[PDB]
Design a protein around this ligand. Structure first.
Ligand code: SKM
Length: 498
């Protein structure tokens, strides 16, 4: 609905001097406006303080005086609370956010007294779930009926599938609408606003200044997710998994898309149920996906067509939604990424029997010496599917062997977790670890201390990544670019996007 989404920054410092500093920071960061959360001020002299903020703020101002009964900090007299908001408006505020519950009385009180550039936002918060379209429609109608200039609705994501309902609302409501879904599972709703008609989204000054679950930083919205480039025709892609907050696929793919000016956007997709997820997002708006634990093997089942290599491997880590009919095509870029990374580093001991284990096992077989599998659950016929061992026995096992971890052991925040005793490593010439967050896992650490050579999971990550790009865009893999992007933008550790 209308203009691209605005980026609003929540200002919650407990003093006026500090809020002024925050509004400046917001301007510096690239935000379009700021929401002054008046209920967070330790000391508050309405007339004086409000006057200051409006004056010193380099950006348009939206004032909120959130009461305890609506999840805010304000306690006390309701009329006094309302007087402040009225003051804000008459002092030059660009917007005020008034709660649905009291919006009618409030808007009536300012009848024939609203400044020229003043807009009233009426909001509703649902901390339980995301209602049906039917109920959302009714809520929109109710908010409209109060005389609101802008409809504002914040719901909670029980499942990632809930976002689609919110997109339908912001995309089809014929009134300026701010629709957001809270929680990590709703993050996508905060990023794709400009594609689905959202009037505004909230971005933080930093990872610690969050006013609601799921809010990303302004910097990430602008530089990581290329927010300004997102539009109605932009195609959406994302990494499917659980957990998914550690993934850097959104970093690399978005840079690449921008670099070649491809009209696409890549986001994190926290999926609990893969089957329902793919069902909830089958429209042409969602052109492709990457898959990690625990959906690599499951994706294979959901694809309409599977690449011979993927079928032969038994798992899919890349999905493409064919424009032609609209079906899903499964591919596997893990195999070539793992094998090449390893060979470059230069009997293979594969740790893990999941999708990554399958791929790496297959490739190790197809290219030289034979391998043996070692999974937490002994049963995971894998060793006989390509020509076995129980995890606990791995410690008990030549002197120039190769070890390849494809499990999540050691992945952040489980930094002190390793899949094998450092005493065994003494028998390996090379050790690979598919885990790339952190770059140097405990395994790789004690491996280099064990005198062996180490191959980082980033080597495999970048390789399998540019192959997905080619699959997604149909453009030749810009390999050199991906190595550059990973080096310049994907080097920081302990990052969680949620
Ligand atoms: O962390 C990630 O974003 C990924 C990890 C690997 O499993 C890859 O196979 C997947 O395509 C993306």
């Amino acid at each position: 609905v209308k203009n691209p989404s605005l980026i609003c920054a929540p200002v919650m410092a407990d003093s006026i001097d500090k809020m002024v500093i925050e509004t400046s920071k917001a301007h510096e960061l690239g935000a379009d406006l700021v929401e002054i959360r008046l209920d967070w001020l330790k000391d508050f002299n309405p007339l004086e303080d409000l006057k200051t903020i409006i004056k010193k703020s380099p950006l348009p101002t939206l004032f909120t005086y959130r009461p305890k009964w609506e999840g805010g900090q304000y306690e006390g007299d309701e009329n006094e609370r309302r007087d402040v908001l009225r003051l804000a408006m008459e002092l030059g505020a660009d917007y005020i956010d008034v709660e649905l519950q009291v919006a009618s009385e409030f808007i009536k009180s300012i009848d024939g007294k609203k400044p020229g550039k003043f807009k009233v936002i009426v909001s509703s918060h649902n901390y339980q779930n995301t209602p049906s379209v039917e109920d959302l429609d009714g809520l929109v109608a109710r908010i409209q009926q109060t005389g609101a200039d802008i409809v504002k609705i914040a719901t909670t994501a029980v499942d990632i599938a809930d976002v689609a309902r919110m997109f339908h609302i912001t995309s089809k409501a014929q009134v300026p609408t701010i629709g957001l879904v809270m929680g990590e599972r709703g993050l996508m709703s905060r990023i794709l606003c400009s594609k689905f008609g959202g009037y505004l989204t909230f971005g933080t000054l930093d990872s610690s200044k969050v006013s609601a679950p799921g809010q990303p930083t302004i910097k990430d919205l602008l530089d990581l997710y290329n927010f300004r480039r997102i539009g109605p025709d932009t195609k959406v892609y994302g990494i499917i998994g659980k957990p998914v907050s550690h993934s850097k696929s959104p970093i690399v793919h978005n840079q690449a898309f921008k670099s070649v000016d491809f009209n696409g956007v890549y986001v994190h997709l926290l999926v609990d149920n893969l089957v329902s997820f793919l069902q909830a997002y089958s429209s042409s708006d969602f052109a492709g996906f990457s898959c990690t634990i625990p959906h690599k093997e499951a994706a294979l089942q959901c694809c309409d067509e599977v690449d011979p290599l993927a079928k032969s491997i038994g798992a899919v880590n890349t999905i493409l939604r064919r424009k032609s009919d609209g079906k899903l095509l499964g591919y596997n870029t893990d195999c070539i990424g793992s094998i090449s990374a390893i060979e470059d580093g230069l009997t293979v001991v594969v740790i893990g029997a999941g999708g990554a284990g399958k791929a790496l096992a297959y490739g190790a077989k197809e290219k030289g010496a034979k391998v043996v599998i070692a999974n937490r659950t002994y049963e995971r016929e894998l060793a006989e599917a390509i020509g076995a061992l129980s995890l606990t026995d791995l410690d008990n096992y030549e002197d120039g062997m190769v070890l390849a971890n494809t499990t999540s052991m050691g992945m952040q925040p489980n930094v002190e977790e390793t899949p094998i005793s450092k005493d065994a490593l003494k028998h390996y010439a090379l050790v690979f670890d598919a885990v790339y967050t952190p770059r140097i896992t405990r395994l790789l650490r004690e491996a280099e201390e064990s005198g062996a050579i180490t191959v980082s999971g980033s080597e495999m990550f970048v390789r399998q990544a540019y192959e997905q790009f080619e699959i997604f865009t149909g453009l030749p893999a810009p390999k050199e670019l991906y190595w550059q992007i990973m080096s310049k933008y994907g080097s920081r550790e302990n990052l969680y996007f949620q």
